[PDB]
Design a protein around this ligand. Structure first.
Ligand code: MET
Ligand SMILES: [Zn+2]
Length: 345
């Protein structure tokens, strides 16, 4: 039996084993190749699942253990993409990254994560949440040397995502999450076509869908950026009204230690809300009570049966020890509030 009230989850990614990849980095090269890597990825999935279960996470992910990066791995499996043709581009309208190049017409040929999801589905009866990159974030994490159009390419990616997502649903995934950190930047594009591309990505799915929009991984570039954002981070106000009208079921957001006004959650009243109650941009471990405090504040704007305690973003850049402490705090804080709501203490 699954957790009916305040079920916990994370944004998706968790640290990989030392023998599989370099610690505490983004885009780590794989330390195994060939059949050893095939086995290692699945063993890492099993170990990550166990870590999530031990920490009391109710809705589990792959720990993103089988991918190098939450955006570029998916892109690299597509036709029309040159994996080893790298360019430095400014991503998120702000900072530089080494990204793959679109060299021709894009298409999905073989499935990407479906065999992984079938494998994970056999390991547990708990709900499974699998993240894919959203169409906008995809076009913002590559160099387009063919379409020469963010919108045209994003449309093609929406179609491809829909194919992958539908097959992940067939594999038994319960929640398909689309990672759209780009939505906290490109407001005009979100309004003109980003929502439409997200709708195309989710068309015909019967499982629950989520969109994740945050202020990024725990890296210096982002913590520096946060220091410039002022007293109120109101980026969500630009996109929440349209997300409210969309067919997305769950909105995953950053909240803990942020300056996002909590009353912005009223704009999505009726949606399920994955409320980030863990700051993945500090190594300081939250107390259970600090997590509980964020969840209590969120209950002013979200019905208890729609509140999904979560992390502000993924944890692949953190150490295993920090991650363990944070996930334990998340589950412990959720339980504090769950017990209050049920008059158990
Ligand atoms: C910068 S958005 C990253 C989201 C991704 N699903 C993760 O958990 O890492
Ligand atoms: Zn994020």
């Amino acid at each position: 039996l699954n957790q009916a009230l305040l079920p916990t989850s994370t944004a998706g990614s968790l640290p990989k084993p030392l023998w599989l990849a370099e610690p505490e980095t983004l885009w780590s090269p794989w330390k195994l190749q060939g059949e050893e890597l095939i086995t290692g990825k699945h063993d890492a999935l099993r170990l990550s699942l166990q870590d999530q279960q031990l920490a009391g996470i109710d809705i589990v992910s792959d720990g993103e253990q089988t991918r190098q990066h939450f955006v570029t791995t998916f892109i690299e499996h597509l036709n029309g993409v040159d994996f080893s043709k790298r360019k430095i581009v400014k991503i998120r309208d702000r900072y530089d990254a080494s990204v793959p190049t679109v060299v021709g017409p894009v298409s999905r040929q073989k499935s990407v994560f479906v065999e992984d999801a079938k494998f994970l589905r056999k390991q547990t009866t708990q709900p499974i949440k699998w993240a894919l990159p959203g169409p906008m974030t995809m076009i913002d994490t590559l160099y387009d040397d063919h379409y020469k159009s963010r919108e045209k390419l994003a449309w093609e990616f929406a179609k491809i995502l829909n194919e992958e997502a539908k097959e992940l649903e067939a594999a038994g995934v319960d929640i398909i999450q689309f990672d759209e950190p780009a939505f906290n930047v490109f407001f005009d594009e979100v309004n003109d076509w980003g929502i439409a591309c997200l709708e195309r990505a989710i068309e015909g799915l019967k499982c629950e869908t989520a969109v994740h929009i945050c202020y990024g991984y725990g890296i210096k570039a982002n913590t520096d950026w946060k220091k410039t954002l002022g007293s109120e981070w109101r980026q969500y106000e630009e996109v929440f009204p349209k997300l409210q009208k969309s067919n997305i079921d769950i909105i995953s957001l950053e909240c803990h230690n942020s300056h996002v006004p909590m009353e912005l959650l009223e704009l999505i009243r009726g949606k399920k809300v994955m409320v980030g109650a863990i700051d993945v941009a500090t190594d300081t471990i939250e107390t259970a009570e600090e997590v509980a405090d964020t969840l209590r504040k969120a209950l002013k704007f979200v019905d208890a049966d729609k509140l999904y305690p979560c992390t502000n973003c993924g944890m692949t850049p953190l150490s295993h020890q920090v991650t363990r402490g944070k996930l334990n705090a998340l589950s412990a804080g959720a339980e504090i509030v769950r017990k209050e709501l049920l008059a158990l203490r």
